């Protein structure tokens, strides 16, 4: 899991817009925004895919 | 330091084509603004160039067919291949900024500040 | 291609308020907001006065606001000086994240 040019084929989802349950796995790309009212997110800045 | 220098100038004969390039100096163009207004002196403007990058379905209803464009971040340059360079299109073009929500500067609210520019660059298509 | 209605030609005395508008329709009334107005003394890139209209931008005079209602309209400019004879527009939305604001309201200072 150490590749000389980097790792770019696993991702990670470091933020989410709404809490979890025990045992939940989510399939959605929904983007991280700021505060309220979303943005959904297409690689741009002041919100967060 | 940071700045937004416009380069790659030169003569476009109808038929041809030519790469422009928009350089963020201070500032690397991977998580910055980039907003390429149009401007001809007199009349009013319009804002074209819809290159955010990662590569899907964003695009305006004039220009289809016509503006490619390509993403470099880490070289912090913007380069803009401007194809098929129609003889009506004399104006000199500004990449700016523009606010989100983000960040401190908006914890509550809705953004959108052009802040920071270009000076531009002068490319005339003349047959 | 795209235009919308703003009032051009646009005078007011030294010290009073004036009013600036710029055109939208009925797909603009339920509950967005996206309204930043501009200011530029012609032939150069614009300058940022007023946006988030009845709100703070960080480094501005505080003699310029902007109100909001209906089709009943204001950027209300006030405390005219002599530097204020430039051009001027908006912003607004388009949906789905998408742009489009006015046709440039040129103010004109006299005394």
């Known amino acids: 899991d150490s590749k000389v040019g980097g790792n770019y084929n696993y991702l990670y989802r470091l933020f989410r817009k709404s809490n979890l349950k025990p045992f939940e796995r989510d399939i959605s790309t929904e983007i991280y925004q700021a505060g309220s009212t979303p943005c959904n997110g297409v690689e741009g800045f002041n919100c967060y895919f | 330091e940071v700045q937004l220098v416009e380069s790659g100038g030169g003569l476009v004969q109808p038929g041809g084509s030519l790469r422009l390039s928009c350089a963020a100096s201070g500032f690397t163009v991977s998580s910055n603004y980039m907003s390429w207004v149009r401007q001809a002196p007199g009349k009013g403007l319009e804002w074209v160039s819809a290159?955010?990058?990662?590569?899907?379905?964003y695009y305006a209803d004039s220009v289809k067919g016509r503006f490619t464009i390509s993403r470099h971040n880490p070289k912090n340059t913007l380069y803009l291949q401007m194809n098929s360079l129609r003889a009506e299109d004399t104006a000199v073009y500004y990449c700016a900024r523009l606010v989100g929500a983000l960040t401190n500067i908006v914890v509550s609210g809705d953004g959108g500040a052009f802040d920071i520019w270009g000076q531009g660059t002068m490319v005339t298509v003349s047959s | 291609s795209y235009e919308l209605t703003q009032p051009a030609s646009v005078s007011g005395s030294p010290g009073q308020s004036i009013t600036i508008s710029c055109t939208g329709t009925s797909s603009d009334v339920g509950s967005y907001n996206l309204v930043s107005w501009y200011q530029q003394h012609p032939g150069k890139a614009p300058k940022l006065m007023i946006y988030?209209?009845?709100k703070r931008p960080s480094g501005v005079s505080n003699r310029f606001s902007g109100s909001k209602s209906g089709n009943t309209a204001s950027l209300t400019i006030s405390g005219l000086q002599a530097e204020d004879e430039v051009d001027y527009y908006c912003?607004?939305?388009?949906?789905?994240?998408?742009?489009?604001f006015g046709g440039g309201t040129k103010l004109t200072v006299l005394s």
């Open positions: 988030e209209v009845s």
């Open positions: 290159i955010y990058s990662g590569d899907s379905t």
């Open positions: 912003c607004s939305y388009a949906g789905s994240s998408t742009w489009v």
